[PDB]
Amino acid sequence: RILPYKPPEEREREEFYDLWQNEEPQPPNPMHIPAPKLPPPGYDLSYNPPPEYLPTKEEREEWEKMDPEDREKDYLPTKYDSLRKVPAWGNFVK
């Protein structure tokens, strides 16, 4: 009726399924407003983009000088000669 004594070391030593097991299509409710998907990455983002996209030094200076949360785009294209020279993005987590 009751389990026998078992030592603490043995107790510590001793101590998945399909969610859609019965899956059926359901009507879509009309109050749900799905969040828009993020736009695909563009030609500006690549580390070695086509050279026409790159900004000039004066535009880069203005971009760096102007305060954050005030820009049309949150980045400027930058050409790098190699992936080792490609640095980590500063605002990834933010």
Partner 1 sequence: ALEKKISRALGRGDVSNAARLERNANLPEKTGKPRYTLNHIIRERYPTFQDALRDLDDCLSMLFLFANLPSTTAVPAKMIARCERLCHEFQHYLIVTHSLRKSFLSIKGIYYQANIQGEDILWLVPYKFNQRIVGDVDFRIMGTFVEFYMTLLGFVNYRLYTSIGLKYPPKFDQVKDDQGAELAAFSLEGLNDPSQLFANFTFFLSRETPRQPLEFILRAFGCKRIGWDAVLGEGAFTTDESDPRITHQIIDRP
Partner 2 sequence: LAAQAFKLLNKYRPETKQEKKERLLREATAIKEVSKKPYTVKYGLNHVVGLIENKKASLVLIANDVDPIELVVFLPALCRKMGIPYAIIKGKARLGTLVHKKTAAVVAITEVRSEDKNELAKLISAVKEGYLEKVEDTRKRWGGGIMGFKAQKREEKRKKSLETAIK
Partner 3 sequence: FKRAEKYVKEYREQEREKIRLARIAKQQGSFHIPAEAKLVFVIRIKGINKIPPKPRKILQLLRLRQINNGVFVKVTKATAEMIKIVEPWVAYGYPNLKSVRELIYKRGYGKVNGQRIPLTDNAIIEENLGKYGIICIEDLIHEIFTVGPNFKQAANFLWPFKLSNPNGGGNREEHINALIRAMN
Structure tokens of 84?
Answer: 């080792």
Instruction: Determine if 5 is a binding residue for partner 2 (CB under 8 A).
Output: yes
- Tell me which residue of 69, 50, 66, 47 sits closest to 58, measured CA to CA: 66
Residues in CB range of 55: below 8 A, 6 or more apart: 63, 76, 77
For Cα atoms 70, 73, 75, give the angle at the middle one, nearest 5 degrees.
Answer: 105
- Measured in whole angstroms, the distance separating CA 27 from the mean position of its chain's CA atoms is 31
Q: Which of residues 18-57 bind partner 1 (CB under 8 A)?
A: 18-20, 23, 25-26, 37-38, 40-41, 45-47
Instruction: Determine if 88 is a binding residue for RNA (CB under 7 A).
Output: no
The 4-33 contact track toward RNA, x by CB under 7 A, reads: --------------------------xx--
Q: Shortest distance, CB of residue 6 to partner 2, whole angstroms?
A: 8
Name the one residue in this structure whose structure tokens are 């059926």: 24
Instruction: Determine if 84 is a binding residue for partner 3 (CB under 8 A).
Output: yes
Which residues contact partner 2 (rule: CB under 8 A)?
A: 2, 4-5
Which residues contact partner 3 (rule: CB under 8 A)?
A: 84-85, 87-88, 90
